[PDB]
Amino acid sequence: KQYIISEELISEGKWVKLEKTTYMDPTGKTRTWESVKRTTRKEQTADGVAVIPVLQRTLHYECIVLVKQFRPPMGGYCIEFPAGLIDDGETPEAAALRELEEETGYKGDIAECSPAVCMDPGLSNCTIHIVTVTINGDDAENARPKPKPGDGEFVEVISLPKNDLLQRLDALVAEEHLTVDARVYSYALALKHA
Amino acid sequence: KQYIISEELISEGKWVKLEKTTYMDPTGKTRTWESVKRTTRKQTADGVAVIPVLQRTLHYECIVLVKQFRPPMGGYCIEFPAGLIDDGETPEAAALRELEEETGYKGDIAECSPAVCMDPGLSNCTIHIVTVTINGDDAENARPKPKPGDGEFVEVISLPKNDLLQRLDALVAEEHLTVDARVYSYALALKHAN
Ligand SMILES: COC(=O)CNC(=O)c1cc(C)on1
Numbered sequence A: 001k002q003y004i005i006s007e008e009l010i011s012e013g014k015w016v017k018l019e020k021t022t023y024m025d026p027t028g029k030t031r032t033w034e035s036v037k038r039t040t041r042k043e044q045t046a047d048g049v050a051v052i053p054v055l056q057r058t059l060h061y062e063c064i065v066l067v068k069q070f071r072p073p074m075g076g077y078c079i080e081f082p083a084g085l086i087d088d089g090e091t092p093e094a095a096a097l098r099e100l101e102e103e104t105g106y107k108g109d110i111a112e113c114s115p116a117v118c119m120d121p122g123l124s125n126c127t128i129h130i131v132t133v134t135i136n137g138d139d140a141e142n143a144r145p146k147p148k149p150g151d152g153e154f155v156e157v158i159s160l161p162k163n164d165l166l167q168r169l170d171a172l173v174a175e176e177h178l179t180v181d182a183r184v185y186s187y188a189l190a191l192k193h194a
Numbered sequence B: 001k002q003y004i005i006s007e008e009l010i011s012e013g014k015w016v017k018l019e020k021t022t023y024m025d026p027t028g029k030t031r032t033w034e035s036v037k038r039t040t041r042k043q044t045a046d047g048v049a050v051i052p053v054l055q056r057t058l059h060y061e062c063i064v065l066v067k068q069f070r071p072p073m074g075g076y077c078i079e080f081p082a083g084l085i086d087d088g089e090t091p092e093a094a095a096l097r098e099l100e101e102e103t104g105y106k107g108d109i110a111e112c113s114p115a116v117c118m119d120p121g122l123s124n125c126t127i128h129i130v131t132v133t134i135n136g137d138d139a140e141n142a143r144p145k146p147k148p149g150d151g152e153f154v155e156v157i158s159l160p161k162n163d164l165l166q167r168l169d170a171l172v173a174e175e176h177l178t179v180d181a182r183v184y185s186y187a188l189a190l191k192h193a194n
């Protein structure tokens, strides 16, 4: 039934743009929408990756590695899966492992890689692959792991037990002013619901 | 350490604006960020997303999802029922309202998240994730009556909670839909809890 008729640019920045989107609704009537898109997407299967990093060590409970950063759009600190945009020509797996190492210092091993999934499809066209990665915390490579943040990147690492993730998140939100990411919360919820 | 210095409007639509955010990086250097906000927020958050757990005796527990044409995505997406919280509406009540409009189901609140961010590197958009149980054996949920508001066109897809990630992958493989990130994160955690 439904499909895009036209996409009129409204305002283009260096990083983001706003479009008036015109589409066919499923009655046969023309309608419009305001859409956001990034300016950076090239041939990549998605804008970005987020990494679900399962830190595994012998005689430790598995931990989920998370990162805390200032997020200008939010006016505040956010707790999120390690994540970044996919470079031109880069595979999602490579981007995941690169971003993981840059933001946390850990070197991971790929476990699985999602199809491109939508970040906020009522608002934007942005997509990521969600890449599950196991981190062998017994390997010396991951012993005293040093984040190699990029220019103007400043990230703290927070590793939380998978078996208590949601309470550990609720506890952190109760103790400082910060926002947990919706994907992080959803994953912690399902850990509880299973 | 980091904080917002100022916000310059770049472009304001009916529904969404684009701002240039000037912020202080932790080294003492001033830096800029392109940020998207909705124009609709008062509110604890912009919206709600409902995790609807359909419980029928002698049946697998299902998670109820909606498929909708998403203009920014230029395609159909599979998502948790969701909408914006009406000014003067609680997140809980928004959840039940939305769940009923989108799916026809009448649920009960199990729990409700703090405001969580949707894509904090791009937008300030936030939601409450609201876990609802649906008594599928109740007479009110026998033939669930979905109420599409103006310009909403919503298919309901219920999937077994214990195979959710495999079932979502099937739909993407077979049907060229995009799965929402929050839905995929929850589906992953269901598999990862084992
Ligand atoms: C040299 O300038 C920068 O790298 C600042 N980055 C952004 O403004 C930005 C906005 C969005 C979306 O993603 N990155």
Ligand SMILES: [Cl-]
Pocket: A193, B053, B110, B131, B133
């Ligand atoms: Cl439940």
Ligand SMILES: [Mg+2]
Pocket: A082, A083, A084, A103
């Ligand atoms: Mg990042």
Ligand SMILES: [Mg+2]
Pocket: A083, A084, A099, A102, A103, A150, A153
């Ligand atoms: Mg990075």
Ligand SMILES: [Mg+2]
Pocket: B081, B082, B083, B102
């Ligand atoms: Mg909706």
Ligand SMILES: [Mg+2]
Pocket: B082, B083, B098, B101, B102, B152
């Ligand atoms: Mg609705």
